[PDB]
């Protein structure tokens, strides 16, 4: 059993256990909430695509 606190009073005063804070600022993305873009390669020996 774990009891914690989350409090975002406003502006820059955001306090709470374990801050997470994902980092995607500047990357060309679809929607502001995607948090990371995909990637396709297609290996050359075979031709079946892969996604990362």
């Amino acid at each position: 059993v774990i009891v914690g606190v989350v409090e975002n009073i406003g502006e820059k005063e955001i306090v709470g256990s374990i801050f997470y804070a994902p980092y995607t600022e500047g990357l060309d993305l679809d929607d502001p909430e995607h948090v990371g873009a995909f990637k396709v390669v297609v290996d050359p020996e075979s031709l079946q695509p892969s996604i990362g």
Binding site: V42, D43, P44, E45, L47
Partner: protein, 52 residues
């Protein structure tokens, strides 16, 4: 008046073959159903950059 004659190019010894073909695609005797058409694929190897 009746028979469509196709000439087998690479006939080995000698033969003529008769057969039937109805209007509906079910009265054939041999069915050739393609599933996926000729799909082209392209890729590259990031060690020689040569297209394949």
């Amino acid at each position: 008046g009746k028979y469509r004659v196709y000439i087998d190019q690479y006939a080995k010894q000698d033969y003529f073959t008769v057969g039937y073909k109805g209007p509906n695609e079910m009265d054939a005797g041999i069915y050739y159903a393609p599933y996926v058409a000729l799909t082209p694929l392209r890729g590259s190897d990031p060690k020689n950059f040569q297209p394949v």
